[PDB]
Design a protein around this ligand. Structure first.
Ligand SMILES: *[C@@H](C)[C@H]1/C(=C/c2[nH]c(/C=C3N=C(/C=C4\NC(=O)C(CC)=C4C)C(C)=C\3CCC(=O)O)c(CCC(=O)O)c2C)NC(=O)[C@@H]1C
Ligand SMILES: *[C@H](C)[C@H]1/C(=C/c2[nH]c(/C=C3N=C(/C=C4\NC(=O)C(CC)=C4C)C(C)=C\3CCC(=O)O)c(CCC(=O)O)c2C)NC(=O)[C@@H]1C
Ligand SMILES: *[C@H](C)[C@H]1/C(=C/c2[nH]c(/C=C3N=C(/C=C4\NC(=O)C(CC)=C4C)C(C)=C\3CCC(=O)O)c(CCC(=O)O)c2C)NC(=O)[C@@H]1C
Ligand SMILES: *[C@H](C)[C@H]1/C(=C/c2[nH]c(/C=C3N=C(/C=C4\NC(=O)C(CC)=C4C)C(C)=C\3CCC(=O)O)c(CCC(=O)O)c2C)NC(=O)[C@@H]1C
Ligand SMILES: *[C@H](C)[C@H]1/C(=C/c2[nH]c(/C=C3N=C(/C=C4\NC(=O)C(CC)=C4C)C(C)=C\3CCC(=O)O)c(CCC(=O)O)c2C)NC(=O)[C@@H]1C
Ligand SMILES: *[C@H](C)[C@H]1/C(=C/c2[nH]c(/C=C3N=C(/C=C4\NC(=O)C(CC)=C4C)C(C)=C\3CCC(=O)O)c(CCC(=O)O)c2C)NC(=O)[C@@H]1C
Ligand SMILES: *[C@H](C)[C@H]1/C(=C/c2[nH]c(/C=C3N=C(/C=C4\NC(=O)C(CC)=C4C)C(C)=C\3CCC(=O)O)c(CCC(=O)O)c2C)NC(=O)[C@@H]1C
Ligand SMILES: *[C@H](C)[C@H]1/C(=C/c2[nH]c(/C=C3N=C(/C=C4\NC(=O)C(CC)=C4C)C(C)=C\3CCC(=O)O)c(CCC(=O)O)c2C)NC(=O)[C@@H]1C
Ligand SMILES: *[C@H](C)[C@H]1/C(=C/c2[nH]c(/C=C3N=C(/C=C4\NC(=O)C(CC)=C4C)C(C)=C\3CCC(=O)O)c(CCC(=O)O)c2C)NC(=O)[C@@H]1C
Ligand SMILES: *[C@H](C)[C@H]1/C(=C/c2[nH]c(/C=C3N=C(/C=C4\NC(=O)C(CC)=C4C)C(C)=C\3CCC(=O)O)c(CCC(=O)O)c2C)NC(=O)[C@@H]1C
Ligand SMILES: *[C@H](C)[C@H]1/C(=C/c2[nH]c(/C=C3N=C(/C=C4\NC(=O)C(CC)=C4C)C(C)=C\3CCC(=O)O)c(CCC(=O)O)c2C)NC(=O)[C@@H]1C
Ligand SMILES: *[C@H](C)[C@H]1/C(=C/c2[nH]c(/C=C3N=C(/C=C4\NC(=O)C(CC)=C4C)C(C)=C\3CCC(=O)O)c(CCC(=O)O)c2C)NC(=O)[C@@H]1C
Lengths: 266, 172, 75, 162, 172, 162, 172, 162, 172
């Protein structure tokens, strides 16, 4: 996005990122950069140990035996990708990680969760992974030679608006990674076809003045509430409380049976 | 909120200019329509309980899954909440008719209602169906030619229908 | 000519453990790839190594993009 | 090219599906429109020269500076007038193609795609072509479905230009 | 891809000419024959499974070496691939019939199919034999006079036969 | 945005590398250019109003139709003239920003990206702004490295427009 | 890609030797010429749109068959592709001038261009004629004496002409 | 290779852009540094043999075990000393290449990439080459810009080894 | 991939016959040699780095032109690639020994290696010599009677020698 929203949302680096294309007759440093970019983006910005590198796959990329898309497929199908994204993750978290790593976006619909779940159940992890890489979306966005990059913060054709908001649920910052078993943040949002407020970068913080407590810290409690007291006017509720009253807010939320969806520092 | 006069006033103040002759004449036309507007508000208010109860009965007859055990209108608390929601929609529609502007209905009743219904599992489409039933009953009440000074109420009926359709769209 | 080790995947089946070389020509700007973020660099003979299990997809892609499959060679 | 028949087959093929009743309804709509589109094209091509000349004259009248300003992009001399008449004829012929085909496919394939780089590169203002297309709208004499479809194509070109 | 209309359009654009009166009248006769074309497409897609299954069974009956162990149609995976090809050829022939042009069939199905079958060891001559069996079954289905407004459908049948022979000659 | 320092850092970061002698040479080139760029920005800022007014008049002179044809996109009335002067001032101010920054990054971020569909939607001819930029080139009165860098920005804008 | 320094560096590393004094002195004369190299690059870049558009206009005035209907430069998509190709060739020529080596022009632009143009039916001879027109415009822009410190720029002009002829030879 | 001109062209080409003032400033910094790099390479070449022998001897002094421990990876015999001197000569020659090219490109291309697999495989300790490069950086006797560039390349190699 | 069992399974399925008594007895004899095969695989794996490094050092001792500047093994990246390739060939030889069938080594490493090495400018003869040195080191290590149950490992050593021969003949 433009700078004025970019600094607020903490997505400046994504906006200024330039797609990396492996051209013909590329030098050694260009193949090195492509391999590094693929490892960074497909493995979700983990510190990749040299013992986890795909030496044969990157040799085939180096000798121009395979394309960038093929190397991306090899990294995605590799046991390293399985270990850190599949074997200890729920299926819905796993496929949103696949959407982030392979297509550079957040899931748009619950039907996309129904797809890749049935696809896994029929054809295994390999068929499920190949669905993303062989998709029309991957072809039109990246082709055979462009390293996949995150696209959820930019307006795409055939995109739902919610994706942009949901993008902030799968991209938590430039210095973040998809390393830690974890549950998807988008489960209820996808199932009920909703959107959640974006609290990313500096958007989550709120004014304090003298209303914050001793340590000048406010907390935002996003809860789902119903009538169990006073009249409830909305199903969604947001409470801004100081640290000193946080426990009290939690307990009164708890004794009314309201479910806490998110708690963040504001 | 706004009424019919203050909406035009707020637009003029943002533009920082006096209301033109055309805007003053349009508000005069609204003033001429005012007696029929009060009539429509009074007729809907006078038949509010019947409108809500009849629409709810029709809705539950055509959507039995609402009242079957496990349905979102099953149990007494949820049935009371459903009847309360129908009454609230009707009341804020009457508010919008009275003011001549849709701000009260939107700001105080419709805004956030869809997310409330989705968050608690209330089927918004069924609420929309109940709103259409209340719409048809209320418009029959307003257009009743018995016991009233005969005149053309098509404009106010269309405005009320628009408020009802805004409610039915907002819920689903 | 290498690639088989990484192209075939992990089906382990004898049917998937075959790769083939597609020779494609005439990849131009069509109405099908109007919104392609990347640009076509070559329209002459390009060689794509496709495992058996993806031969259905790739040729469709080729057939969708106006490319002409002139030859397919066993690897 | 985008047309009801080709679009229906492409949609069925992307899903790997046989042509169901939906595709048949698409073909039925194409049949309902095709005769009127064909007569629209026939009427436009019979009066093509006068329409193109009148559109060029209207562009010259609304933008007189194209008639006297010296430049490669202007129609001050005979070369510029021939280029302008040729461009307007291209627009009319491709619109007739769209009427024949039943979709904006010929316009997208032949004219719309890349027209921005051409108008910018050769310093041709799209407003001139908008006026030419408006003249064609106001003087094609079509009625009914032939008018509706022809004007849909002409406004498609205008919206793409503006 | 080209339909019957866009093919003439593309040729005219290549020549820089408006469609002549004769081409417009030819495309008018084509529109006049559109109902029969739609009904033939519907008839084939309504009996697609029977066409594919009967053609495959007849093909294996007269070419038993296909289904013997070691044959190309032996094992379940290769049999499913064979039936799948049968169905794909039939579907793209229906596409060509629907558009009225062979561009979809040549560009999306027969593009590289011969050397596909060569590089896989598939006996493309037997594929052509199966395609002819589909051709006779489908032409018998299209020409069935029962339960339809009677008329002469010889032209569309000849076009469908030409699409089938196109596919069979491509795979041979 | 595009400056020697930020791109050197972004290229180094995408490669996961420390800044090496290459990036240091990039910084040395920026330092060599920066004083001339700053004094070009000062000279353009001091004579900004005269440059903007003269550029608007030059556009009106070469395109007289913009001064008497009625319409939202033209400068026949005071509102059009105010919009035109504001646009030319936008161009000059962003060019000074480029001179300060040492790259076309201000032009790309603020003006160049999305200029074409703006010019298209509001029916604004890019040749007008090209003539304004040519006047700014011919009347800024700069010399040496300041002139060279400023003219590079001005004709970068011209190339983007044409 | 290589530049002027890395070309001799790669040759020396393959030979396994330190750059000789003569090679270092030649690279010093190149450093001395670097200011004129930057001026040439800047002058071509600042008039890139004018160079491409004027050369294209000249290439279509003579050789009118490109822009006639059915010609390779006919239709807006193909015309835009042709203009883009001329701009790409000019841009890579500026890249080669900037680096002092033609490796960028060969590896990234001219590699496979003849096979590309042949597979598209693009008339590579006409592309070569357009490249010659861009060459003549670019050379007379570079050799413009006004507004610049006077000096002998014959060597850099010869290098730019060599890059342009190299592109024209590759496409022909 | 990681040189300023090639990097500038690479980042401009990755965006599909002509070279702008940013790339021109990169070339200006390269020109400012290049002559100093050339005299640095000449001085290192003229004193190459003595520098290589002194660095090898320095390694033998700091790590005396390599002088008298039997093994293929050690310099106990004449063959080991020849291999060690050849390796140090490789380091010095590639550093001169980096000085000529104006970046760490030759070190990355010829020496840095894959050096640690080599050192692990042939059981060669990188500390030997680090102290040797330290000796080169301490006894090459350059000054100013030449010394700073040469030290940057030697420190780049040292940091890669450690 | 094939192992010793699935290979004969594939021939029998192609012939559509059950495995005969002779084939089952041969497989039983293979099973009786399984412990020796596992020992050989383990010994080569436990000495893989030593085998590759010693063979590479011997391969560069003779044939010095590989490591001289301009040679294929010169520069760190190409030396690392050479070492990597030797280790990869040894790893696939161990895979072939483990499975008892040469399919993994042929399909994933050997087939197409001679053409890749020719199109890179890699000397096939020198890498074949390196494979021979890895052969001799691995065969000495496998045929080490210390610290293992005594027996006749001639058959498994012959199989390993055949796999090493395959990779040397296929790479040259
Ligand atoms: C459409 C809404 C129907 C309709 C309305 C209508 N009403 C009037 C006029 C009047 N109605 C009132 C109302 C009230 N007087 C009271 O004391 C109260 C209770 C507090 C109410 C609600 C009044 C005062 C008038 C004016 C005097 C009169 O009765 O005539 C009209 C006449 C026009 C006017 O606007 O004054 C009309 C048309 N008529 C229909 O036919 C619709 C079914
Ligand atoms: C114009 C009336 C107002 C305005 C608009 C504005 N919007 C954005 C950015 C985005 N807009 C969207 C919306 C969509 N993208 C889609 O694909 C769809 C259809 C499904 C929608 C509705 C999105 C997602 C973005 C962000 C991503 C992107 O910009 O591509 C901006 C830019 C904000 C910035 O800082 O860059 C602007 C300016 N702004 C106004 O002031 C007007 C009132
Ligand atoms: C060392 C001083 C302390 C420490 C560190 C530690 N960090 C991680 C994991 C990660 N570190 C990062 C940080 C970055 N990655 C980037 O790309 C950027 C640049 C913008 C930054 C700043 C990330 C994202 C991770 C996530 C995991 C990953 O592998 O990348 C770990 C690993 C934790 C684990 O393995 O579970 C550790 C150990 N730990 C200490 O005890 C020190 C105080
Ligand atoms: C060492 C004994 C000889 C030698 C080797 C050498 N090889 C290459 C380059 C490649 N080797 C391969 C082979 C494979 N890669 C794999 O992943 C597998 C398993 C499927 C194999 C068999 C490939 C593909 C390449 C190219 C990619 C790459 O360079 O990594 C080189 C480098 C060549 C170059 O850099 O141009 C070298 C040096 N060289 C000798 O001199 C020895 C005889
Ligand atoms: C009846 C047509 C449908 C139905 C209704 C239903 N609604 C709720 C719960 C709530 N309804 C609201 C709405 C409002 N409250 C307000 O104060 C306002 C006006 C300012 C509105 C519009 C809210 C906020 C809730 C939640 C709090 C509450 O429970 O009162 C329920 C209860 C759901 C539950 O299980 O808690 C129900 C049953 N249900 C149907 O099935 C009909 C289609
Ligand atoms: C007429 C409305 C105004 C006008 C015309 C004019 N046009 C050009 C040059 C070109 N016009 C086109 C347009 C097309 N060619 C196509 O293939 C199609 C799509 C099928 C279109 C719409 C193109 C590509 C050019 C440039 C190449 C060519 O000369 O053919 C000129 C000449 C401009 C120049 O620089 O030579 C002119 C004069 N100009 C006016 O003043 C009229 C108001
Ligand atoms: C059946 C009548 C005959 C037969 C068929 C057979 N075909 C294959 C394999 C493939 N067939 C195709 C063709 C297509 N795939 C598509 O998606 C389309 C439309 C674009 C077509 C036309 C392809 C690409 C393959 C290979 C890829 C895949 O099968 O997924 C086989 C399998 C061959 C094998 O050994 O694996 C078979 C058996 N075989 C006969 O004997 C019949 C005469
Ligand atoms: C030709 C091979 C056979 C044949 C065809 C035939 N059909 C018609 C006319 C019509 N057929 C339809 C078709 C459909 N109506 C639907 O709703 C659908 C399902 C979505 C379909 C496929 C229609 C609409 C018509 C026109 C109305 C009518 O029923 O008459 C004709 C008559 C001529 C014409 O083209 O209209 C003919 C000849 N008749 C045969 O004998 C062949 C076996
Ligand atoms: C002056 C050379 C000619 C002219 C000008 C004119 N421009 C507009 C309208 C707009 N100008 C812009 C441009 C920018 N906005 C920015 O933020 C920047 C980047 C920093 C630029 C370059 C835009 C966006 C508009 C439209 C919105 C707005 O009005 O501000 C108009 C008015 C058009 C309209 O319909 O309102 C005019 C008159 N007119 C002439 O005749 C001159 C030759
Ligand atoms: C050669 C084709 C033509 C020519 C060139 C020429 N230029 C110089 C000297 C300089 N040119 C520059 C360039 C720039 N300074 C900037 O700020 C910018 C933007 C980034 C540029 C492009 C500089 C810095 C110099 C040095 C100082 C000076 O102004 O002189 C020379 C002189 C010799 C030299 O190599 O420096 C020459 C010859 N002169 C012609 O006559 C040709 C037409
Ligand atoms: C113009 C002077 C002549 C002309 C040109 C023309 N070219 C194409 C199509 C392509 N040109 C290229 C070349 C490149 N693309 C790149 O990205 C680069 C760098 C590697 C180069 C050199 C390519 C690949 C294509 C095809 C794909 C694409 O268009 O992007 C066309 C279009 C052909 C078509 O049928 O679409 C044209 C018209 N044509 C003439 O008549 C002039 C002589
Ligand atoms: C000297 C500081 C110490 C030392 C050296 C020593 N090195 C080797 C062997 C090799 N050295 C290299 C290094 C390179 N080759 C290149 O091409 C480049 C980049 C241009 C470098 C840096 C390599 C690859 C080898 C192994 C292959 C070869 O023999 O050439 C040895 C011999 C190791 C062996 O097993 O024979 C030795 C002795 N030894 C000392 O004791 C010093 C302290």
């Amino acid at each position: 996005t433009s700078l004025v929203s970019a600094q607020r949302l903490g997505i400046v680096a994504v906006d200024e990122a330039i797609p990396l294309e492996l051209r013909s007759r590329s030098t050694e440093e260009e193949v090195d950069a492509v391999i590094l970019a693929v490892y960074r983006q497909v493995l979700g910005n983990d510190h990749l140990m040299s013992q986890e590198r795909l030496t044969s796959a990157e040799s085939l990329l180096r000798g121009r035996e395979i394309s960038v898309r093929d190397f991306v497929r090899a990294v995605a199908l590799s046991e390293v990708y399985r270990q850190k994204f599949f074997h200890s993750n729920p299926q819905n978290r796993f496929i949103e990680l696949n959407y982030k790593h392979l297509l550079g976006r957040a899931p748009y619909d619950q039907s996309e969760i129904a797809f890749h779940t049935d696809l896994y159940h029929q054809g295994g992890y390999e068929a499920e992974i190949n669905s993303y890489i062989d998709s029309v979306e991957y072809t039109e966005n990246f082709g055979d030679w462009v390293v996949p990059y995150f696209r959820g913060f930019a307006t795409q054709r055939n995109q739902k608006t919610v994706g942009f908001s949901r993008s902030f649920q799968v991209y938590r910052g430039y210095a973040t990674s998809d390393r830690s078993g974890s549950r998807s943040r988008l489960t209820r949002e996808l199932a009920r076809n909703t959107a959640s407020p974006v609290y990313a970068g500096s958007t989550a913080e709120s004014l304090r003045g003298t209303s914050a407590g001793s340590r000048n810290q406010m907390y935002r409690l996003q809860v789902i509430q119903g009538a169990a007291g006073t009249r409830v006017r909305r199903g969604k509720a947001e409470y801004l409380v100081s640290y000193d009253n946080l426990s009290a807010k939690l307990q009164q939320i708890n004794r009314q049976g309201d479910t806490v969806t998110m708690i963040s520092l504001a | 909120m706004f009424d019919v006069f203050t909406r035009v006033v707020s637009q003029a103040d943002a533009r920082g200019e006096y209301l033109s002759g055309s805007q003053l004449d349009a508000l005069s036309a609204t003033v001429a329509e005012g007696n029929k507007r009060i009539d429509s508000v009074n007729r809907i208010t006078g038949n509010a309980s019947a409108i809500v109860s009849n629409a709810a009965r029709a809705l539950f007859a055509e959507q039995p899954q609402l009242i079957q055990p496990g349905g979102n209108a099953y149990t007494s608390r949820r049935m009371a909440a459903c009847l309360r929601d129908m009454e609230i929609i009707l009341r804020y529609v009457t508010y919008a008719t009275f003011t001549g502007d849709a701000s009260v209905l939107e700001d105080r009743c419709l805004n956030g209602l869809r997310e409330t219904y989705v968050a608690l599992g209330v089927p918004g489409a069924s609420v929309a169906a109940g709103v259409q039933k209340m719409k048809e009953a209320a418009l029959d009440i307003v257009n009743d030619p018995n016991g009233i000074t005969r005149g053309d109420c098509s404009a106010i009926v269309a405005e009320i229908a628009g408020y009802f359709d805004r409610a039915a769209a907002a819920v689903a | 000519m290498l690639g088989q080790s990484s192209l075939v995947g992990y089906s382990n089946t004898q049917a998937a453990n075959r790769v083939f070389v597609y020779e494609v020509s005439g990849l131009r700007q069509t109405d099908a790839n109007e919104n392609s973020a990347h640009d076509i660099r070559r329209s002459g003979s390009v060689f794509i190594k496709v495992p058996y299990a993806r031969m259905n997809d790739e040729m469709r892609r080729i057939s969708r993009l106006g490319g002409t499959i002139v030859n397919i060679r066993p690897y | 090219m985008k047309t009801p028949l080709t679009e229906a087959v492409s949609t069925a093929d992307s899903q790997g599906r046989f042509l169901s009743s939906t595709e048949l309804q698409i073909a039925f709509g194409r049949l309902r429109q095709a005769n009127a589109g064909l007569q629209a094209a026939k009427a436009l091509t019979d009066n093509a020269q006068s329409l193109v000349n009148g559109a060029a004259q209207a562009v010259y009248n609304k933008f007189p500076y194209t008639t006297q300003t010296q430049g490669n992009n202007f129609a001050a001399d005979q070369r510029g007038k021939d280029k302008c008449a040729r461009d307007i004829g291209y627009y009319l012929r491709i619109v007739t193609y769209c009427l024949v085909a039943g979709g904006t496919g010929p316009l997208d394939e032949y004219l719309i795609a890349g027209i921005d780089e051409i108008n910018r590169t050769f310093d041709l203002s799209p407003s001139w072509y908008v006026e030419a297309l408006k003249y064609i709208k106001a003087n094609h004499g079509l009625s009914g479905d032939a008018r509706d479809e022809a004007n849909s194509y002409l406004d498609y070109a205008i919206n793409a230009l503006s």
